[PDB]
């Protein structure tokens, strides 16, 4: 066993080793290992991506116009965000400017995804870490109605409703076929909600499972389908026709009416179901404002997103701010440049890849994806990993750093950047939210905080959907219908050699696609995706990523039942297919 210091942490692999494989209630394949000391406190944390597909290799030789369709399939959970980054990247390489309506519709696609993804994560993925579903069977339906009505104007709150939900659950469990509830952590002492709050939460889990299907109707209108909508280089393919013959063959007034009806219902559900539930989880789990801080009080990163001025990706255009904080200095939000080779770099000394020199980090325009499964001694065999060897290569996830710093990305990172750049809406929302919980600002830099920030982002995005829809309708009123630029659709119009970056803020954090085009085809396509940052393995200096840092120093009540580990990992909303691509 060894011990070393990094980022204020003592990394110590003495003591009992615990393995959590598979991690569930995530997208894709992750393994986690920890060591715990004699006080059952984590002294070592190991994040491992247990899948790889190789989209950066598959994209070579494709037509740049087809790239979005391939890379969209990086992930069906964050569906669409890789398509958006792809068309941005190709447009940046070739020098294409899209019409305003295309930009607006792309912003609608992204806000729709934020709403949908954050909602499903809250209930279906993270929810059962905080809601003891079986304990709901003990709730009094009238007290449940009373609790719900105290927290929200939401209509669906009758005692009869909560009895009916409880009875449904009782009948489900009675025959022993507990399905997704089988062999859960129910009754663990870290479940702190009273029975009435567990029944309210469970009822909302079911309401959210139903309602989330509606949100993506917006993606069906503009993008044909969800999951995995369609896009084009040059704008969007959903041509508009309001008042001419053949409007039946296009986005028309009836299609836009459908979109508006979805936006309203989406805001109403998030504001009156998700938001109060998130605040309730906070009220009943305040000690988790002090657990899982990790890198969130040290180093956070946003590239920014939602350009409101079409084809302008600068600070005055992006509605979601970009910037970096390092060394815990939130008074100096630093500018991020994705072309600068000294900024974003990826290491593979602790990952299953080959570089000519594994001690140096490669900017994505110099990126290499040469898979090399080489786990070393893992106390088993190459096909039987009993214990990862975190002194050597232990993951299919590359290790991104920013100016050599290990960063956290995602909703909490974004909130902190916007807050400290002085975004007024963000300051007021954050201050009001922490005031309501009677917690200091620092309480946001936590596992609880990640959940709170995610819910507040769903609210933000639902508001922006309306703003963007109104912008589109203003252009239509003014007779501005254009949805595609095709001046540079034909490969004969492109530079022989060019490269470009497409970037955005996906639901999980900062996303970039770096593309080099030569002779009409993709020569290089490198992706660095938010869970790549957060779930990163170590680097040549031994620095730990966001997941490992957030797990460090965490008490476990019951070692064999990894609820604390799940709570903190799920708070980051891991998408492993994204991380590895």
């Amino acid at each position: 066993s060894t011990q070393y210091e990094t980022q204020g942490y003592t990394i110590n692999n003495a003591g009992r080793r615990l393995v959590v494989d598979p991690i569930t209630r995530i997208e894709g394949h992750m393994r986690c290992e920890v060591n715990i000391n004699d006080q059952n406190v984590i002294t070592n944390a190991v994040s491992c991506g247990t899948m790889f597909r190789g989209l950066e290799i598959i994209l070579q030789g494709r037509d740049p116009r087809d790239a979005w369709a391939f890379v969209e399939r990086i992930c069906g959970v964050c569906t669409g965000v890789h398509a958006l980054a792809s068309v941005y990247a190709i447009e940046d390489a070739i020098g294409i400017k899209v019409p305003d309506n295309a930009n607006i519709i792309r912003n609608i696609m992204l806000a729709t995804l934020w709403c949908h993804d954050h909602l499903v994560h809250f209930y279906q993925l993270a929810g059962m870490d905080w809601i003891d579903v079986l304990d709901a069977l003990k709730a009094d339906p009238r007290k449940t109605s009373e609790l719900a009505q105290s927290l929200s104007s939401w209509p669906k709150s009758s005692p009869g409703y909560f009895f009916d939900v409880q009875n449904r659950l009782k009948k489900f469990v009675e025959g022993g076929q507990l399905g997704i509830f089988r062999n859960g952590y129910w009754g663990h002492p870290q479940y702190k909600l009273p029975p009435e709050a567990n029944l309210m939460g469970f009822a909302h889990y079911l309401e959210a499972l139903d309602f989330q299907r509606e949100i993506v109707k917006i993606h069906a209108v503009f993008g044909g389908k969800n999951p995995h909508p369609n896009w084009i280089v040059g704008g969007m393919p959903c041509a508009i026709n309001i008042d001419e013959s053949g409007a039946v063959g296009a986005v028309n007034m009836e299609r836009l009416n459908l979109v508006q009806s979805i936006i309203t219902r989406t805001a109403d559900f998030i504001n009156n179901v998700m938001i109060p539930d998130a605040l309730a989880i906070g009220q009943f789990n305040k000690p988790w404002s002090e657990i899982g801080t990790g890198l969130s009080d040290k180093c956070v990163l946003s590239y920014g997103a939602f350009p409101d001025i079409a084809n302008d990706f600068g600070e005055k255009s992006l509605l979601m701010p970009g910037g970096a904080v390092i060394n815990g200095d939130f008074n100096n939000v630093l500018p991020v440049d994705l072309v600068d080779p000294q900024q974003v770099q990826e290491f593979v000394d602790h990952a299953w890849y080959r570089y000519p020199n594994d001690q140096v980090g490669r900017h994505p325009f110099d990126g290499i994806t040469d898979p090399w499964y080489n786990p070393g001694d893992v106390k088993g065999s190459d096909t039987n990993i009993q214990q990862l060897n975190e002194q050597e290569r232990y993951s299919w996830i590359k290790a991104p750093r920013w100016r050599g710093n290990a960063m956290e990305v995602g909703p909490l990172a974004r909130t902190l950047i916007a807050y400290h750049k002085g975004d007024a809406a963000t300051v007021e929302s954050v201050d009001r939210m922490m005031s309501a919980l009677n917690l200091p600002l620092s309480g946001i830099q936590s596992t609880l905080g990640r959940i709170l920030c995610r819910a507040h982002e769903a609210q933000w995005a639902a508001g922006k959907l309306q703003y963007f829809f109104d912008k589109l309708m203003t252009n239509l009123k003014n007779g501005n219908l254009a949805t595609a630029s095709t001046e540079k659709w034909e490969p004969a119009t492109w530079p022989t050699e060019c490269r470009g970056v497409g970037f955005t803020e996906a639901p999980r954090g900062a996303l970039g696609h770096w593309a080099a085009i030569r002779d009409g085809k993709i020569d290089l396509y490198q992706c660095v995706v938010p869970t790549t940052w957060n779930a990163s393995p170590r680097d040549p200096k031994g620095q730990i990523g966001a997941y490992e840092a957030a797990l460090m120093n965490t008490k476990m009540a019951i070692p064999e039942q990894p609820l604390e580990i799940l709570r903190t990992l799920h708070s980051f909303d891991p998408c492993l297919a994204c991380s590895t691509h």
């Binding site: 062999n183 209108v221 969800n226």
Partner: protein
């Protein structure tokens, strides 16, 4: 009255088919899970993780040996001794074979499980391989598409539960009910195809009238699925209705049949 046990496993995948499933409008996915099936293992949704999830898996396939449906999303990679996809420290393929041995039938959801999908596109770095090339002694129902249509997924489940039988299939193992006809055989823009009325460039006057997308690369003429009939997301749209040609996403090898914008 007991519900049919379903074990849902995930190989290399993007999880789009799981997301599609939960979009179901009728029956709602909620009602599928609470009333129609017993979804007894599913990495995406289940409470238990790690050793607890392994215990569920082992108990269900043992208790219900011969009696569960196995749903598979994604596929096994044969490269690196299968360790491009790792489950409880071992190759995914081992879990696949264990789950398959006890199943009464297998549903291969999506183009990944059916054929390969994007990870199998040239040059297939991981040697991703569809389920029917590894499991060769069980009924496999292919439900292709990237992902398949939500209400098609739920209709297949309801059919199996209500009728107590597998759907009848074509020579490739796809359910005749939703894969018997081509997209182009039920496309509402076929009038325009017949008239030689085509979109030639995005957002041209033809595009704004809903003309045929054949010259923009539409692969509807060779693609079998229900998108032009059943449509997507509670009948709201499908790719062609919103202005993009069909990519061919239900057909084996569709990523490698040339540019989506070429003939």
């Amino acid at each position: 009255k007991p519900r049919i046990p379903v074990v849902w496993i995930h190989g290399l995948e993007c999880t789009c088919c799981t997301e599609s499933f939960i979009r179901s409008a009728h029956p709602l996915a909620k009602d599928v899970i609470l009333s129609l099936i017993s979804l007894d293992y599913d990495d995406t949704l289940m409470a238990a993780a790690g050793t607890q999830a392994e215990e569920v898996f082992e108990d269900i396939i043992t208790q219900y040996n011969g009696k569960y449906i196995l749903a598979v999303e994604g596929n096994p990679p044969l490269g690196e001794q299968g360790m491009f996809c790792i489950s409880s420290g071992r190759p995914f393929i081992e879990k696949l074979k264990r789950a398959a041995a006890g199943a009464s039938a297998i549903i291969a959801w999506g183009t990944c499980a059916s054929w390969g999908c994007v990870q199998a596109a040239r040059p297939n770095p991981t040697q991703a391989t569809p389920i029917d090339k590894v499991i060769t002694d069980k009924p496999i129902i292919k439900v292709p598409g990237c992902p398949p249509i939500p209400d098609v997924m739920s209709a297949i489940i309801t059919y199996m539960v209500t009728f107590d039988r597998l759907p009848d299939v074509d020579r490739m193992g796809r359910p005749l009910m939703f894969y018997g006809q081509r997209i182009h055989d039920k496309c509402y823009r076929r009038a325009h195809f017949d008239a030689g009325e085509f979109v030639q460039s995005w957002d041209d006057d033809a595009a704004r009238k809903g003309y045929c997308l054949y010259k923009m690369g539409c692969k509807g003429p060779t693609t079998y699925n229900a998108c032009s009939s059943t449509r997507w997301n509670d009948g709201v749209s499908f790719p062609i209705q919103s202005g993009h040609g069909c990519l061919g996403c239900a057909e084996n090898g569709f990523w490698d049949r040339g540019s989506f914008y070429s003939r």
